[PDB]
Amino acid sequence: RLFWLLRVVTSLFIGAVILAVNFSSEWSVGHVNANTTYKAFSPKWVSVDVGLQIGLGGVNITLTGTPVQQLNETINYNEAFAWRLGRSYAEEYAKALEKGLPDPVLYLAEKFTPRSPCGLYNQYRLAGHYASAMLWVAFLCWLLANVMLSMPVLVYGGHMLLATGLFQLLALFFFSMTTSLISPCPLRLGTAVLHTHHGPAFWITLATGLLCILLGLVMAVAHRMQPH
Amino acid sequence: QNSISWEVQRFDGWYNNLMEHRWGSKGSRLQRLVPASYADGVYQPLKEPYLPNPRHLSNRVMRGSAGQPSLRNRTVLGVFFGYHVLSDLVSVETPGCPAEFLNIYIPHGDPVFDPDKRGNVVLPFQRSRWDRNTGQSPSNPRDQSNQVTGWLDGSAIYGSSHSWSDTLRSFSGGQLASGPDPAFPSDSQSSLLMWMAPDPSTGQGGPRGVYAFGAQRGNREPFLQALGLLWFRYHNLCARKLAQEHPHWGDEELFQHARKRVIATYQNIAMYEWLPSFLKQTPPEYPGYRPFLDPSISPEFVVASEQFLSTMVPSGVYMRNASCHFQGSGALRVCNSYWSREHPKLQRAEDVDALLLGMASQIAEREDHVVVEDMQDFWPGPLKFSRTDYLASCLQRGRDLGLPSYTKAREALGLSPISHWQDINPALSRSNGTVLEATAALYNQDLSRLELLPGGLLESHGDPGPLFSTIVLDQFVRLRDGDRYWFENTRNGLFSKEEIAEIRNTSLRDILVAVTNVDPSALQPNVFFWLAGDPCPQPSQLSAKGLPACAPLFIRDYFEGSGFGFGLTIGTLCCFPLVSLLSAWIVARLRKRHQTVQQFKRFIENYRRHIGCVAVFYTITGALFLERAYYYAFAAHHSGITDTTRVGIILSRGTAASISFMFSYILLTMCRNLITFLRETFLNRYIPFDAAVDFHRLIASTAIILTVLHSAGHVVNVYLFSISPLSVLSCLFPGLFHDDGSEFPQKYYWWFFQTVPGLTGVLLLLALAIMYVFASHHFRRRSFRGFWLTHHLYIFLYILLIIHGSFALIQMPRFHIFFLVPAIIYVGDKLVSLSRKKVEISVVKAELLPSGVTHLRFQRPQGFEYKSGQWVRIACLALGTTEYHPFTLTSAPHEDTLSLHIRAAGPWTTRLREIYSPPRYPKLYLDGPFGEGHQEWHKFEVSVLVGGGIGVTPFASILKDLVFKSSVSCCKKIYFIWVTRTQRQFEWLADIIREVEENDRQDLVSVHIYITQLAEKFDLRGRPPFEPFFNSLQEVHPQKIGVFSCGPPGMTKNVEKACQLINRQTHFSHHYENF
């Protein structure tokens, strides 16, 4: 019964990676270790490691001191500013600015605010909206590829595996048309720069899309020319 | 870690005072000196019935010559350095919008704006940004918000934020990014950064020639660009000097040190150099930093400072080089230089230095009510008009903001009261005071109404009036004494004692000498004054004589050339049906290669459930449409988008929900397994499940009508958008549009073929036209495969219909709310109908009978076990497609070679009769029985089988099987009663009645016939009296008796009434079976 366990493993892995990637904030990942200013009313410079993570629905900005306790305070921050149709970015930025959290986090949050010169908000609010809708479409197709394989219509259960594998690479494109503009915008942090490159979720979606596109095709060709 | 041993000053302004982190910030709100003076009390501005007309007030008092010299010899570099400084502090010019205008109304026959006496002409004017948390009750009226850092912190050189101070920096040392020329900044940062207004003299609105400064609009005059370039080059100079004296320093260290030095020099110059010259009295002194003073910009400061600086701008500005040869007539006119992109003279650093050395020697105009014509008549128009009165827009802004009057705002500052009009300016009325009379006549001799611009300008003799002077002075003292990063603050740790004593000895001559590399003896010690001993005198006072005239007016026409293209695009959209019609036509040609009351009563009797269903469906759709349209028209809607597009937006937003619902449930209609299960339940007695295709076509037609309405509404919308300014469009669809002053909206074809909704809407129109024309009655009878090939577009349709709402243009997507349940059910039923398979019956024999019926008989597959009264659905592929049509079997189960009786009633049936004509070769695709096979007449001693109309189809099988089983096995006296109108198509049924009568010798089945058709018949060669029937039935034999009935609603209702009226006293179950 090895082949049955293999089929169950493949189906469950594909479903799990679709679900996890649609809700993961790791599509674009940058990281750097800079020397920045901690916060207002103090002339003291700190040593921290700063990095942002963009996930189709908002950004995570993490400020963590290399010594977590270096200025009598513990430095471990992880703030989230979301721009999806449900929420608003400017109100979140205003509340964060009224709170008083450290300056580099406020800066990296400002880079994505609406009407900023860099214009990084309206191409992340729509690309991350379409690449999160073409990943809810590649789920209803995976469910149908799970059903049509249970009650054998495999001749038609090998096309849902060309639709799921295509609707993933049709969403790995909307989030591919954004690094074209995030590259010119500067992200200088004190004496260091910040390079944001494609992260785990992107490569995982690429691998899963390729796997489904190939598996559906091979199984369809086989069960067509040889229903063994 | 480095040499930045201080707290770097933020760009936005926050966190400057410890207690209140918000006082001087990017979007703070202006703090009034006097309670708001709106019309209603909250946000309504005073207007023309109450206060005189702005364009008629400007003409009467603020109009005159342009050759008057200043009384204190203030050089025009002072005027424009003031224009520069007062853009570091306050900016209330950008219109924040839920788009709301208050226009200027020109009088009749204005020689400049209404030259041909065209009745009344309107100058547009828009309200500015307001604080969203104010303007809702007379306790807190609306307050505006300035969009620049309200400190004197060089918020005009380095921008007022941090993402802004990056887009104009090079990170190559501490330096602001220059262009190919080291002297000028980089024009290459033009979009998304600066203000682009079309040069009103030519019309060019391109991003070439728009430099990158820290003030969004510093390119408004070459004379303001001159000071912008001066400060830019000074920053670069001091920074490169720092680099050549501290080589190992980074980029940030150089930038921050040069920035703090430039900011300190700027503050020193501005305060202690410009104020003692603007109003001729020195700021008092510097006490300790006061952490409690309120440094909030007031609107009266805006009025005083800027709308008084506008009183002394000259007509033309001179130009001279180091030895002052005033050529580079050469005095470039002002009214032709607004927003100049590339000026043929100011194309090199030497020319900018010449412009500065010429401004620093030209005595600006005098300080009184008279304003030159280069601002009064020829100020660049904000929208649609290319020209605009300045002083008639400054009054509209003073009444836009809640500015006080001149007598109300003269007693809230401790100043004495004025008696009458002659006492406003006592020295003015001593010589030609016929302007105070002209302005009293305008105000109906009512002194307590002066809008505080004509009241302030009328009191200023040689200096600003006693009213403007106190406002400017105390505002600047509050700016300096409430600032933590003030260069004279010894607590902030920015500069030492000698670095403060060195910054406090810097004049504007030192900066000009350092930047322009000019000998210090070619200028004057105080650049803001020319005092009869300073070098390089003026040639002659510059009157507006001998200067090039001002470029005349022209109205701007959006939607001017692209009207024919718009009409052609609409005509092409409308001729989508014609292209599909032609394609299907060539496809066909290629494939060929007192009594009326009773009539209405019978009709309403038959068609009750159909009327109920149609009424409920159309009620629901109309309710959705009415909800949306009512919510939009006059209801709880933020009236941002609904100004003149009420009709279009109402139409579109009302039809959208209705068509989404109609499409989702027209998908629901075509699911046949659920219908096959449901039509054998009590639901059928309330809704008819045999009219699903008619309901389908009805829904389709209604949906196409509503879709045409939707598309027409959106076409009207797209037209009304292509003529709206950018300032209006930029707050209907925020995020999609941005308001740089270019003001030209996107063309129609941008909305149509370059947006997701428009493009997918055109695609959906094409797909709908194809699918609707190929599905016509006169185009599916010809080719069943044409019909079958196009209709698979509905998946493409339901893909597009998700992309059509995938945007935040008007509202949130709601189609996916409607589409879930019907699509889930339909996909489930498709999987159910696609799992089971049965195919390939062989037709044994098929004779052709009259009246249309075609007796068909095919072999019985081995596994085929079925009951009496079950139908099968068959398809012949020889002619057309694999279209499954249902037919009730007419053979007893004990008999092999299952039979059928098919009645010619349309395309498929006539084609099938043509196929099996000439008596049987083709083979069908029988799809098994579909029924419950209710055999409940075994539980009743005596049954009464009643069939009417079309419902007499399975009774042949029923009776044959019943007599066979009664004979073989060895249900008492079952009776069959069938009432028909014409007895036309059912003659084979009479043959079967005869064959059953002949077979039965035990006298079980007794048939009875009622033909019920009078006076209209062919003689064919009464009524079914159920009332005495049951009375005699129980009498003749003492049997519970079943009276199962199948037929039209009239007959079954009649037999129901009969059996119920006669039941009350056996059982008489009356179990109406729909086969």
Ligand SMILES: *[C@@H]1O[C@H](CO)[C@@H](O[C@@H]2O[C@H](CO)[C@@H](O[C@@H]3O[C@H](CO[C@H]4O[C@H](CO)[C@@H](O)[C@H](O[C@H]5O[C@H](CO)[C@@H](O)[C@H](O)[C@@H]5O)[C@@H]4O)[C@@H](O)[C@H](O)[C@@H]3O)[C@H](O)[C@H]2NC(C)=O)[C@H](O)[C@H]1NC(C)=O
């Ligand atoms: C993307 O970001 C979101 C939002 O942060 C993440 O979701 C949150 O996940 C955390 C982790 O479990 C949940 O728990 C919260 O975390 C709090 C973190 O506290 C730090 O930050 C505080 C402000 O945010 C800060 O006050 C504090 O230090 C400061 O104050 C101290 C005094 O209290 C002072 O001594 C220090 O020197 C310093 O000045 C902390 O450093 C934690 O405190 C709480 O337990 C809290 O529950 C959150 O609930 C989650 N968010 C929500 C809205 O529920 C998300 O995981 C991120 N994405 C990924 C992929 O990780």
Ligand SMILES: Cc1cc2nc3c(=O)[nH]c(=O)nc-3n(C[C@H](O)[C@H](O)[C@H](O)COP(=O)(O)OP(=O)(O)OC[C@H]3O[C@@H](n4cnc5c(N)ncnc54)[C@H](O)[C@@H]3O)c2cc1C
């Ligand atoms: C002996 C006999 C038994 C029949 N038994 C049944 C039955 O048990 N159940 C049943 O639903 N129909 C039954 N029908 C109707 C028969 O299916 C239609 O005449 C035929 O399927 C379609 O006719 P057409 O396509 O040639 O003409 P069309 O012009 O396509 O016929 C138009 C009419 O037929 C109806 N119709 C079309 N397709 C279907 C379909 N797939 N299902 C139902 N109605 C349709 C439409 O509502 C429309 O009013 C029976 C017909 C005959 C002659």
Ligand code: HEM
């Ligand atoms: C007037 C236009 C239309 C007509 C005349 C029409 C007619 C029909 C007919 C006759 C059928 C199938 C009949 C059969 O089963 O033999 C059909 C099937 C269908 N039509 Fe339409 N239809 C029309 C418009 C639409 C529209 C707009 C839709 C859009 C959703 C649509 C969706 C369907 C669907 C979903 C089927 C299902 C067929 C199947 O898969 O079994 N139809 N239509």
Ligand code: HEM
């Ligand atoms: C000129 C062609 C059309 C234009 C310009 C157009 C434009 C629009 C726009 C702007 C919306 C709302 C935008 C959004 O928020 O997503 C909309 C919604 C919609 N349009 Fe169109 N449309 C057009 C044609 C059609 C056609 C032919 C259909 C028929 C299906 C159609 C069906 C819809 C539907 C169902 C919505 C529902 C919106 C929703 O999802 O709630 N439109 N259309």
Ligand SMILES: *[C@@H]1O[C@H](CO)[C@@H](O)[C@H](O)[C@H]1NC(C)=O
């Ligand atoms: C960061 O600061 C530490 C503090 O000692 C210093 O040693 C280090 O060189 C600095 N590095 C950078 C990249 O600024």
Ligand SMILES: *[C@@H]1O[C@H](CO)[C@@H](O)[C@H](O)[C@H]1NC(C)=O
């Ligand atoms: C200034 O302009 C005069 C005009 O002829 C010219 O002769 C002179 O060379 C210019 N430059 C100076 C004086 O430095």
Ligand SMILES: *[C@@H]1O[C@H](CO)[C@@H](O)[C@H](O)[C@H]1NC(C)=O
């Ligand atoms: C300092 O005093 C005055 C103030 O402007 C100035 O005239 C003088 O030249 C300055 N002394 C210098 C710069 O050595």
Ligand SMILES: *[C@@H]1O[C@H](CO)[C@@H](O)[C@H](O)[C@H]1NC(C)=O
């Ligand atoms: C102002 O400039 C004119 C220009 O020649 C000069 O005659 C006059 O004396 C100057 N004013 C004073 C007070 O010196």
